[PDB]
Symmetry: D2
Subunit: 357 residues, 4 copies
């Protein structure tokens, strides 16, 4: 079993990182282009990021649902900035309009400056306490239960979502995080645990940690990985494109982003930045794993670079560890969605092997 | 100037009130029908209600934006249940995708049971205090400012909306309310004040109160009214349809029927009569300063066509010129209809 | 089995016949409204008329296909005015883009003035000869055959349709006609024979003739009927709306319309106009069968008028004769598509009974 | 004035010519992708080819009209296989539904085997005779006339198009042809004369011939050229992609590469070079009087973005300002979560 996702560039898109040269503005028409591409190419779904640097994920996903037939949408919810009852009604409404194509990404928010801008003045441990109480209300209201809940952070009385969702018991819960509070929350409530593109040894230990905590709660969680991808027909062209992606990234822009990443209260972001740390020589931190994207961009920071056989081999490495979901992205997002689907899909298991023509 | 709105029945639709007979379920397909009808008929926009009995307004409006060309969407925001910065980013994205077709309806929420279900335990005076602080943060972040704000209820530090809206300075703020705190809030921050379909004398006094308070703040507010409509070609058919609507004294004013208010629907009063009678009541409200008219009918799809074909030619421009590409008009295979 | 169709008013729509009062212009937006209504309400398909009085059927059907999911489109082809090879490629493309939702209505054209305007100067017998040779080439090219054909009217050499259709062997062929040449063509080539809304006794004889001729060709054809419908909650409201539909029809327009029909070289049009002769009194030619639409409109001319039980009863009467397809219409087409689907669908067989 | 068109690959698309490697099937979804790409990028329109090797142009164009806002469709009509009255009603209906976005490409058909497959057994001189009579009836019915016409090939009596088009007097007529019979027909009836991508000296001589014949009839025709284009940021990558396109001398003129003519593609020549070289060759053709430019690339979706992002700012208005919608803000991917792209 394997689900291959693509990515909607709600932060912005282009041919190069860091610079405005070759940039592509994010419009309704361009978002339609990427979503309808992933829909017709046969991708399982698309991940839609959230945050201050993005357009709103719920507005984007809701607008693209009537314009696609099979594509699923992994939309992010951020506990602490919205009522859990209201978030559930949004999830129910969007899941009903899409006829069961909604996927939920639980996001706790690792930037204290952005969180204070949204009105949240909570420590790292406190944010996961709100998320813990949030998900308990969210999951229960969506199953038709009039919820009475009074916790340390959230309190609802007769919380009801009158319109039931299509997917039972609720739209699947995806979650990413590397701290101990994140692994506990994932093991207790979520359905799929997501990690960024660390080397296989680091992901295997993170998966083993989550699998252990989930077993202690009598549950089993599925796993997925988030990666960039620069795949070409030959290995020489792929690494040539990787160097070309970052040719306009000055040293003062790398210092500007790293100064902002150190402000983050995120353990998952810390492990991603602990792979590059501003270096430019020796960026291949692992066989066909290139950490050049993390020099400027937040969140995901590594990419699989190589020919179709080299990239498909790295996928089997992660799949052998138990990872079943793969969320890819490329620059630019439209062109690379076709390139991955035409070079890598025939090398992947079904149904992706048979989607090529 | 006049803006004529229609209504999206996101709580549900049907042919009759009270009973489930002839009911029509709210689906994506039917919502497309009503929105695309109001879009092509030439309505200025549609009001989208909010509450526990409705589907989410932001999901529906966002889904209908790429499916319409000119129609505007009056979407409701609710302070107290969402971050003001995040609500502004939501408004910005929907306004950008729609190319300036987003209108904001500020709703405070008058049901204490529903408010407790959403996690808000605030009194009437407190609810308008959050709304006051909410709009100050909401309006300023959308104007490009990095907002630092610490009030009695809300507090943000370095609140920024990185994507600017299409409409400047922000999507217009519509607001409805009858208390003194609402009239003060409307006179200070909002752009359009909304009132229910009261008799013309009662609306004039409410408008005079808001218009007086707005002058003290150096502002002028526009006004709008929300009214159901049962218009037929003759007055006899209209009152026959009104009686049929509630078959499973009510005329509180000339051609103002309060039968819709018997149950918890969109409004509580309705204009019932022939096209000349309905246009006469509209001209009455317009003379008091009302420029926006938010209408609805049962069912909303059929009645959107009925109002637009019987009343639009009797209204000011551009609605007078919307009634009626050339060639044949009506069903022809050689002689054209004349 | 039963397939219920609706109708796209490409001639124009409105609340009243004959006059421009209460008319509704046919735009892309309004056609989207009616097509998307029939799609979501659960109708099997929509019939799209063709002719000089219509917008082009192929442009409209192709434009509405990507805007609907399940609805099928009964598009009309006219042999004699387009190449059979080209017509087949058009059908294949629309059938492929729609993923098998294309239905073909074979139209021969009964107006000699309109036919001469299109460049066809053929007698009634000759028109069915071109249609005969047209359909033979059309059906064979769509089955992957490089066709060589040299007939009295048409001649092709190496006619190929390189893109195969989705429905096999080809999109189903619907056909309407009342002449003897039409019954032969229907019995030999088409898949569904269509008739206008005549009384059940006259329809039963038309169906018996086509099934008799089809047996001599070793084939069996299915049958469908075309009707208007004015259904209300009560029988009094239905007859009140039927009288109201024709209140603005001029007596000069009645003679001017029937004068153009007396010049029509069509038996189906003559059998439909002879049910009224312009006489306005006593229009109910059968229980709940009202022939008021035929006073001005060509083609369909009768309507089922009554309460939901009366309308559903007349439908079952036609179904007992072997009619499986029902193509309904009302004025205006958008509102009345909802009215039929909400008043009559629960009284019909599945899947229409469970769609509400 | 300048109109830049793209191309809908209704015959098929892919990364390479001749081979099936990297091929891309023509589906409704992919045709939407290319059409909606040209729509948002700001192209004037798209050319839709016709023939036995294509899906029907009228079905595709009509299907794409409600899915686009400004993009125009240059749809081909072929006299001899359809009645002129019916063709006009089709043009009127599509022009009305699109609100004046329909363009007509008059195609006579140069393949006798394909013409015989469609039922036409006519010589070269005869084919242009039907086209002459076809356009005369087609143009007159669209202007509201009840047309009576009896020629050597076509005959109509009381031909009327009851629904008038949006563009007056009729959707513009584009036409391509190299024979003397074609140049006479173009100078007399059509609005835009189209030619393939010959070297600039040959195009100037063909355009002057049509302009002389048109002047003798008191008319003036506009001109357009059809070209492939392989434009990259550097000249070395462009020629590398051109060599790779046909791997499974050719530079017949400065930046004019004749590799597309090896197989039955869209045309036979291509502009290959850097953005500065391509815009220079366009300025050379534009100085001759060419106002319409119909470009294409392989694959058509990716290259529609590549030409529009590298060449549009170097072209006259409105294409120079199209590279920058009304939206403002973060132009590019956000650096971290608060640093605007440099
Ligand atoms: C696959 C994936 C997607 C994520 N998407 C987002 C996002 O859209 N917005 C965001 O603020 N954080 C996102 N994150 C980060 C986490 O949700 C969370 O904010 C951060 O990791 C803090 O958790 P931690 O301190 O336990 O590592 C994502 C993480 C992963 C693994
Ligand atoms: C259901 C139905 C639909 C028809 N639709 C058309 C049409 O769209 N255009 C048309 O010219 N004739 C139409 N006709 C009429 C016939 O197809 C035919 O063209 C004409 O009346 C000559 O046939 P006849 O002499 O055998 O009656 C239709 C007939 C039926 C029964
Ligand atoms: C821009 C352009 C586009 C053309 N498109 C087509 C087409 O789609 N199908 C086709 O058969 N011929 C096409 N042609 C060719 C002409 O229609 C015509 O068949 C050919 O020029 C033969 O005429 P000639 O002997 O006068 O040169 C095109 C020509 C040009 C210049």
């Amino acid at each position: 079993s394997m689900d291959v996702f693509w990515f909607l560039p709600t932060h912005g898109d282009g041919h190069y990182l860091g610079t405005t040269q070759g940039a592509r503005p994010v419009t309704l028409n361009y978002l339609k282009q990427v979503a309808q591409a992933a829909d017709s190419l046969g991708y399982h779904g698309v991940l839609i990021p959230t945050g201050r640097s993005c357009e709103d994920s719920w507005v984007i996903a809701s607008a693209l649902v009537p314009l696609t037939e099979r594509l699923r949408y992994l939309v992010a919810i951020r506990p602490g900035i919205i009522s859990p009852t209201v978030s559930a009604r949004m999830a129910a409404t969007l899941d009903r309009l899409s006829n069961g194509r909604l996927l939920i990404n639980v996001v706790t928010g690792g930037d204290p400056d952005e969180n204070r801008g949204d009105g949240s003045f909570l420590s790292h441990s406190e944010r996961y306490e709100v998320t813990d109480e949030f998900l308990k209300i969210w999951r229960r209201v969506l199953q038709g239960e009039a919820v009475d809940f009074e916790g340390k952070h959230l309190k609802v009385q007769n919380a009801k979502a009158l319109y039931p969702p299509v997917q039972k018991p609720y739209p699947p819960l995806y979650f990413g995080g590397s701290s101990d509070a994140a692994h506990d929350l994932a093991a207790e409530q979520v359905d799929v645990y997501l990690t960024w593109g660390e080397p296989p040894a680091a992901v295997a230990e993170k998966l083993a940690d989550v699998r252990e905590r989930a077993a202690r709660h009598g549950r089993k969680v599925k796993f997925g990985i988030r990666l960039h991808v620069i795949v070409r027909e030959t290995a020489e062209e792929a690494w040539k494109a990787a160097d070309k992606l970052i040719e306009h990234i000055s040293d003062e822009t790398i210092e500007a982003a790293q100064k902002s990443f150190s402000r983050f209260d995120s353990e998952g972001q810390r492990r991603m930045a602990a792979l590059h740390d501003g270096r430019r020589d020796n960026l291949e931190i692992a066989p066909n794993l290139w950490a050049g994207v993390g020099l400027v961009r937040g969140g995901s920071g590594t990419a699989l670079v190589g020919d179709p056989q080299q990239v498909a081999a790295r996928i089997k490495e992660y799949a052998d560890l138990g990872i079943e979901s793969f969320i890819f992205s490329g620059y630019p997002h439209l062109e690379e969605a076709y390139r991955f689907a035409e070079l890598v899909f025939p090398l992947l298991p079904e149904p992706y092997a048979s989607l090529a023509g």
